[PDB]
Structure 1
Amino acid sequence: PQIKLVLLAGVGFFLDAYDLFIINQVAPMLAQVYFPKTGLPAQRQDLMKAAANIGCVVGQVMFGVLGDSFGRKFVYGKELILIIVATIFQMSAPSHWDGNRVLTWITICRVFLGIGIGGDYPMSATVVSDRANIHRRGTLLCFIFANQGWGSFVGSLVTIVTISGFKHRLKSGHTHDVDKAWRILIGLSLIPAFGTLYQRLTGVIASKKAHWQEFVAYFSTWNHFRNLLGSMLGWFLVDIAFYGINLNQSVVLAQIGFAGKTGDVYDKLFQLATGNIIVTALGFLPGYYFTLFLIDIVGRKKLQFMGFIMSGLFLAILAGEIDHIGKGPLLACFTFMQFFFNFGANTTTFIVAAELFPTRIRASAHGISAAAGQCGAILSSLVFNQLKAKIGTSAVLWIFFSTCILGFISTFLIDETMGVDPDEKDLEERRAR
């Protein structure tokens, strides 16, 4: 039936999400092995974490050219093998290498990893927005998008299980086995990857200038231009804080009381992994499902309004009080923020970008909107840890705060897509004129 296809897209989203966010759990282990006395260099850590998002836009543009040039049967399988190979090379960095060399190994591997993740990422949204043509199209988009929380959650769940497995061996003095652990965290993504592989198995310039002429003609009108504008900004703006935080969630929990002064090698890693599962289970994951139950009742905008404006509130409380109040109050607000990321802008911007546009231009407008989002992701990802040392963490959170207010303001540019058919709206727009 039609069901088996959306699950395959879901596990595609899950694997992308797992592979994307698992770098947040892997980074602290690399520190203990190759840089035990000093932290990971700021510039090198930023490059490593942005690498996946950098490839993510390269993927959907390259797999866009190749997919438009030679069809869909030329990209469907090849996207999955690229992230599999990138996982293996990343997994098998020579353990006898220098710290900087190991880092440079992993950064490069994750770029190719991003290129594959970029393929099935916008392609999983169109298959179910074009197919449904029903009021319950948003809940379908949200369900596949909800796998992003499971990717972050399962990665967090995998981490505590892995760390607790090395407990006795670490306590008995075998401290280098953490070098084995971080390879296991990355490798475990291979299990659904191979399973999906089997199930997936078992006049070009004249047309590009004609669709460009229609695209330019369409988005040269205000009521049509602004819909692409708000779609581009909202996805761009939410991804700044969203990926800057979620790819650095372990860094924030280090300013909070989860990075102490007590404990040995195991005690340190386990307390940090404890906070990560708390936040992603209590906040990050359920946010997708609150969005799931209310988009076709409340509307995309009101949820986007709330999502942008609520997560901002908790960002200001952090920035003002992070250096002044205790761990408890800070942790609670951090979880609330993560909750309203997925219960709000992060999920709706993905939905709104696929729901706003008539099909005749939707591929570009969603592609540009998704590309716009990844642009915000790479911005924060590339500079997050560098700013943290130059201006301080409180100052950086004030920046993420400002991006949320602008997202709230920009959301006014969007038409509410709940229950509206963008193709029927375009047809009625034309028949009246």
Structure 2
Amino acid sequence: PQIKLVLLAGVGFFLDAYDLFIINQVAPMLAQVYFPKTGLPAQRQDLMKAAANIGCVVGQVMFGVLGDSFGRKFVYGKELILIIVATIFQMSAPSHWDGNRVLTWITICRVFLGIGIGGDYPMSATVVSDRANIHRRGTLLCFIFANQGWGSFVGSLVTIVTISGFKHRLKSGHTHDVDKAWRILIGLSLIPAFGTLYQRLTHGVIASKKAHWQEFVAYFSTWNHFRNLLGSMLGWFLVDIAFFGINLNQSVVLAQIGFAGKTGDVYDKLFQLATGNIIVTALGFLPGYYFTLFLIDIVGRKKLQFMGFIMSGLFLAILAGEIDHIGKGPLLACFTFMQFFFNFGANTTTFIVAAELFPTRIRASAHGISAAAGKCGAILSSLVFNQLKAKIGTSAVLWIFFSTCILGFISTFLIDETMGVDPDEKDLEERRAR
């Protein structure tokens, strides 16, 4: 009855999160094929990874305007087939082109892939909070956001099982078949995608649009009402810098650690790297959502956001100051703890807070702005991560993600705690006094 709605959101949020972080495990496969000596060129790699995040905001704009003036009934499944088509053209990049052309071929696909991802955001937010107007809504939201861990986890689980299947003999001799591997990692998202389709299947516009804008400006022209937007935009902007800047390039960081290898065949190289991703995502990235799941409505959003920023920042400082002076062991845990504390702290909080602060009359614009700000932080680091790594050093970049944590720690002060607070009644009692 009511449950079948939120599960679909989790599926759509498992799907786009999957496709989003899969690149982190496909990029090493493309290198071994089309760039074995010199690794993936920095700029060419970064654009491909930021593509889906760049496409993710233009999809919000495009599907946002086509939601006001209807081209389809809430444009449902339209976003889903666009990511499917984009997903297909990725894997079907013909095997005999050049290396660089295939890369540029994939980036374009991920942009349109992102466009579909931006259309699913108004689903996850609005279907729960405003329809329910009930306490402890956040516990329901975090369950959907937990699918982000499954997307990155299943992507890691699918990878190790796929590589182990090819390793039985085929890797000992046939090395180009890794070209098939990355095509399968992208392709397996079609089976749930087709299941979703199977579930989907089974005049005064400007005058009315500019009317709610005057109301929006009047609301957020008040200090107490204005500061709440900053915290939502800032925190989300800063996490997605380090969150996506790392998770989209998580395999690259693991390569800086002893996880690289320097010995073994091509299979051992791929399996160890896939072994690292599955460990970090199972021990930190994913459970941080479920730790968040059991405590947001007990401890509070801001309180976890502080910890998320301050702890992930703490370990980010240990990494940078000791990445070039300490072995595989200590550096691994601080990295997993960091990923643990992103989703256990600010990464999940920034998403939930943006929907719990604002009255329903303006929640649509604010959540879209804050999310877009988060995507900008996602695309910034994603677009520039690997480039700086060669120009400035990996430690220096980690000190940057450290500062974004402190700023997010500081920025969290601007937020009102939303535990048990109905934002609608908040507006009423305020308007009564005046």
What TM-score do the two structures reach when normalised by structure 1? 0.99
Rounded Cα–Cα distance in structure 1 between residues aligned with 2:200 and 2:369 = 27
Q: 1:77 maps to which residue?
A: 77
Q: Size of the alignment, in residue pairs?
A: 433
Residue by residue, what CA displacement relative to the aligned partner does 1:374-419 show, whole Å, maximum 9, x if unpaired?
A: 0100000000000000001001000000000000000000000000
Q: CA deviation at 1:22?
A: 0.5
Deviates more, 1:115-124 or 1:105-114: 115-124
Task: Summarize the Cα distance change of 1:74–1:420 in structure 2 as closer, same or farther, 3 Å threshold.
Answer: closer
Rounded Cα–Cα distance in structure 2 between residues aligned with 1:122 and 1:148 = 16
Q: CA deviation at 1:145?
A: 0.5
Q: Is the partner of 2:361 in helix, strand or coil?
A: helix
Q: Find runs of 4+ consecutive structure 1 residues off by over 2 angstroms.
A: 168-172
Please say if residues 67 and 75 of structure 1, whose CA atoms lie closer than 8 Å, have aligned partners that are also in contact: yes
Q: CA deviation at 1:74?
A: 4.4
How many percent identity over aligned positions?
A: 100
Q: CA deviation at 1:208?
A: 1.3
Q: CA deviation at 1:168?
A: 2.9
Please say if residues 305 and 344 of structure 1, whose CA atoms lie closer than 8 Å, have aligned partners that are also in contact: yes
Residue by residue, what CA displacement relative to the aligned partner does 1:295-345 show, whole Å, maximum 9, x if unpaired?
A: 000011101111111100000000000000000100011000000000000
Rounded Cα–Cα distance in structure 2 between residues aligned with 1:315 and 1:343 = 16
Q: CA deviation at 1:121?
A: 2.1
Q: Is the partner of 2:36 in helix, strand or coil?
A: coil
Rounded Cα–Cα distance in structure 1 between residues aligned with 2:433 and 2:243 = 41
Q: CA deviation at 1:129?
A: 1.2
Rounded Cα–Cα distance in structure 1 between residues aligned with 2:258 and 2:174 = 27
Rounded Cα–Cα distance in structure 2 between residues aligned with 1:392 and 1:9 = 40
Q: CA deviation at 1:131?
A: 1.5
Residue by residue, what CA displacement relative to the aligned partner does 1:339-383 show, whole Å, maximum 9, x if unpaired?
A: 000000000100000111000000000010111110100000000
Rounded Cα–Cα distance in structure 2 between residues aligned with 1:248 and 1:121 = 23
Please say if residues 10 and 145 of structure 2, whose CA atoms lie closer than 8 Å, have aligned partners that are also in contact: yes
Please say if residues 170 and 265 of structure 1, whose CA atoms lie closer than 8 Å, have aligned partners that are also in contact: no
Deviates more, 1:124-133 or 1:195-204: 124-133
Rounded Cα–Cα distance in structure 1 between residues aligned with 2:415 and 2:287 = 25
Q: CA deviation at 1:171?
A: 4.1
Q: CA deviation at 1:276?
A: 0.4
Deviates more, 1:71-80 or 1:355-364: 71-80
Residue by residue, what CA displacement relative to the aligned partner does 1:5-55 show, whole Å, maximum 9, x if unpaired?
A: 100001000001101000111000000000011110000000000000000
Please say if residues 136 and 419 of structure 2, whose CA atoms lie closer than 8 Å, have aligned partners that are also in contact: no
Q: CA deviation at 1:123?
A: 2.5
Higher helix share: 1
Please say if residues 170 and 266 of structure 1, whose CA atoms lie closer than 8 Å, have aligned partners that are also in contact: no
Confirm whether residue 185 of structure 1 aligns to residue 185 of structure 2: yes
- Structure 1: segments with no counterpart, 5+ residues: none
Please say if residues 292 and 345 of structure 2, whose CA atoms lie closer than 8 Å, have aligned partners that are also in contact: yes
Q: Is the partner of 1:170 in helix, strand or coil?
A: coil
Rounded Cα–Cα distance in structure 1 between residues aligned with 2:122 and 2:319 = 33
Rounded Cα–Cα distance in structure 2 between residues aligned with 1:141 and 1:171 = 43
Residue by residue, what CA displacement relative to the aligned partner does 1:161-189 show, whole Å, maximum 9, x if unpaired?
A: 00001103344310000000000000001
Q: Is the partner of 1:295 in helix, strand or coil?
A: coil
Q: CA deviation at 1:136?
A: 1.5
Rounded Cα–Cα distance in structure 2 between residues aligned with 1:427 and 1:200 = 38
Residue by residue, what CA displacement relative to the aligned partner does 1:217-260 show, whole Å, maximum 9, x if unpaired?
A: 01110000100111111111111000000001000000111002
Task: Summarize the Cα distance change of 1:120–1:171 in structure 2 as closer, same or farther, 3 Å threshold.
Answer: closer
Q: CA deviation at 1:73?
A: 1.1
- Structure 2: segments with no counterpart, 5+ residues: none
Q: CA deviation at 1:72?
A: 6.4
Confirm whether residue 432 of structure 1 aligns to residue 401 of structure 2: no
